[PDB]
């Protein structure tokens, strides 16, 4: 085994921080803090972060560095029976890349829309607005920026549902094209160039959040937003759904077991201290979500106090924050064009490296499993991103938000919880915390503390089971803004998630069938790792 390496420890650290620090940090965590008790919510968030989140982060990073192989081969060597975990994680990342890059396309479309002297989401007079336009959010009316997003950027109103996708928006197809060009030319030559490009796509978000914070805190009414954001209401942490929300946010915010950390740590020097790296980058993604919460809510308090808009209306998660509420706040402050440009460039750079992560997980896993691809990386990556583009043209249609919202709901989440549960079982129970502690000792020089072993062994599977149970309990059929998705759309989304999950027991059974002996010998032969 002779493989390339990062060409610098800071390239690894910035790649992992870039992948981890997603838009979920900006548009999800602050909403949860506000909704789920303010600063009190950091007690659940911090507990679930410590017992279960960082353990699985450190676990996948140590596995990836030890095995020096991608997801498919790492999982096929640690527990051959569970080689299906590698295919599951790769296929999950493959589905995630169809929808996730649309958010970056929207970010670039707003960035390119921002160059006008007056920002087009400022006003209700424009042709795409209805008589129900009002300048800012109101009950039973649409804001000017909501009108702009739904009716000019998306044109979502001209589509009658997921079945009626309508015509391609070619400005959006061109923005998704530019997204995939930046991804291609960042991932074709491999970590040699990806590790350099993340010096921008992982450091610009902090270079923006700094000034976006200085601005937001110097706006009249920012302390009111900070109060709404962090006022402690400790009764809130006595509810189980608060803890489930904290754990789901932790798990998906870090992304432990998504296959990306294997693909990256695979390129570490074998004796690199992955323990410090796991701690450093887990802290940096939690603190980045926290600081982003101030960046957001300072401006949300500015809206609630100055623009005369109710706080319950603007404080929202997901696209309707960064593409509707926050631009509607930006358009009302001096040098609005500048804040618009940097804000949407920040969103694009929060997304870009997060998509590099998934794409690099797929490319490393397949190039490690198939040498034919390893020698032809530039051509495989061109075929891959051309596939992504031609599928993503569905998202670039008028009804494309319904395709985005469906894939976003079902692609990854149910399945990735199931995969990471089986990863925690395979490592901690079948392979062993003893063997894995020996492997970590041999790499970094000291065995993992008893805290980490008890976590990996007992807490992390119960942690993922708690998440999955409270994620299935709150299941409700998919709806988006008074549009109830047809039942066949939910069936298709369950086929997506199930196709991701079925790879685990399908490959398990195929392995069990293809190995000779009686059942005890088949299990033994498929349980012994590859070096033992």
């Amino acid at each position, epitope marked *: 085994d002779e493989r390339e390496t990062w060409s610098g420890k800071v390239d690894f650290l910035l790649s992992v921080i870039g992948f981890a620090v997603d838009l979920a940090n900006v548009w999800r965590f602050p909403y949860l803090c506000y909704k789920n008790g303010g600063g009190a919510f950091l007690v659940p968030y911090g507990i679930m972060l410590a017992v279960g989140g960082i353990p699985l982060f450190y676990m996948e990073l140590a596995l990836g560095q030890h095995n020096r192989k991608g997801a498919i081969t790492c999982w096929g060597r640690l527990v051959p029976l569970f080689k299906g975990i590698g295919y599951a994680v790769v296929l999950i990342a493959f589905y995630v890349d169809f929808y996730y890059n649309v958010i970056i396309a929207w970010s670039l479309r707003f960035f390119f829309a921002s160059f006008t002297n007056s920002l087009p989401w400022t006003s209700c007079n424009n042709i795409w607005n209805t008589p129900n336009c009002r300048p800012f959010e109101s009950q039973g009316f649409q804001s000017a920026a909501s009108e702009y997003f739904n009716r000019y950027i998306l044109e979502l109103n001209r589509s009658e549902g997921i079945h009626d996708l309508g015509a391609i928006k070619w400005d959006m197809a061109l923005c998704l094209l530019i997204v995939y060009l930046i991804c291609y030319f960042s991932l074709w030559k491999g970590i040699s160039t990806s590790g350099k490009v993340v010096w921008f796509t992982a450091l610009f978000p902090y270079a923006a959040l700094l000034i976006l914070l200085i601005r937001g805190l110097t706006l009249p009414g920012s302390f009111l937003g900070i109060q709404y954001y962090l006022t402690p209401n400790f009764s809130a942490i006595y509810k189980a759904e608060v803890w489930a929300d904290a754990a789901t946010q932790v798990f998906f915010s870090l992304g432990p077991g998504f296959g990306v950390l294997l693909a990256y740590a695979s390129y570490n020097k074998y004796h690199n201290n992955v323990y410090k790296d796991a701690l450093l980058t887990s802290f940096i993604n939690s603190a980045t979500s926290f600081i982003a919460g101030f960046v957001i809510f300072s401006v949300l308090g500015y809206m609630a106090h100055t623009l005369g808009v109710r706080i319950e209306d603007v404080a929202t998660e997901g696209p309707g924050l960064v593409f509707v509420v926050y631009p509607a706040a930006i358009a009302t402050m001096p040098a609005s064009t500048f804040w618009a440009l940097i804000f949407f460039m920040m969103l694009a750079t929060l997304g870009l490296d997060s998509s590099f992560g998934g794409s690099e997980a797929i490319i490393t896993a397949l190039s490690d499993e198939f040498p034919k691809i390893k020698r032809n990386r530039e051509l495989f990556v061109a075929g891959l991103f051309s596939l992504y583009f031609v599928v993503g043209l569905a998202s670039c249609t008028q009804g494309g938000f319904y395709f985005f919202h469906l894939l976003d709901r079902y692609a990854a989440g149910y399945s990735i919880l199931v995969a990471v549960f089986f990863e925690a079982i395979a490592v901690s129970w079948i392979y062993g915390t*003893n063997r894995f502690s020996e492997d970590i000792r*041999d790499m970094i020089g000291f065995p993992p503390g008893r805290y980490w072993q008890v976590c990996w062994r007992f807490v992390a599977p119960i942690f993922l089971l708690f998440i999955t149970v409270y994620l299935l309990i709150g299941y409700e059929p998919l709806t988006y803004a008074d549009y109830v998705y047809p039942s066949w759309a939910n069936a298709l989304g369950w086929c997506i998630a199930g196709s991701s999950v079925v790879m685990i027991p399908a490959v398990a059974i195929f392995k069990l069938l293809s190995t000779p002996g009686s059942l005890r010998q088949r299990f033994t032969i498929l349980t012994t790792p590859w070096r033992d």
Partner: antibody
Amino acid sequence: EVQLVESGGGLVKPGGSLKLSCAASGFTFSSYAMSWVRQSPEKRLEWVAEISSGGRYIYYSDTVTGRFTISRDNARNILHLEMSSLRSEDTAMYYCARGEVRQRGFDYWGQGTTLTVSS
Amino acid sequence: ENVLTQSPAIMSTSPGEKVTMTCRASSSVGSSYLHWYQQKSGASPKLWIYSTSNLASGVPARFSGSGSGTSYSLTISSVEAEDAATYYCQQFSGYPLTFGSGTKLEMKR
């Protein structure tokens, strides 16, 4: 307290063979990587071999590799060094040294046992 | 292998003097992988200092460690009658785990 008691070791003809054995007690032997460390009659300490906590990572020095074989008996808390094709300059006192954490060195040492290789 | 040379090979120090002995590696050791052992005449070595600065368990507080890179040092502030031993530096950072020459501390009378 942790106690390590190296045993075996005696006169051996050059070209001969021997098995040193160290009985470890008072700690969870199964957890700790153990090293064998010899010391020539000149008090030059020389590290001989290492075995990891469960015997999956065996490291030898250039002077003894291919000839010696460190092994471990986590069921009995016994550590062994087989020595084969011994030669004159292998004559030394062989300590057993516990060394799990590389960053904390060899914390506990045994008494050592002398090997005389001579005709 | 990272050969570690210790100077001086022998040193006579009357009780009370402040003495320093230097372990010089051929190759850069990590500052948390160089250790010092005290072998009393007729007994197995004890871990004396680990990670270049940390007194091990039960080490009298007069000892100290310093240095980094390829030059490390063990220093004794107020040498006493108990310091008569041979002190060996060791690097644990890369196999082979080379011990150095050892510096013998002798009392003066």
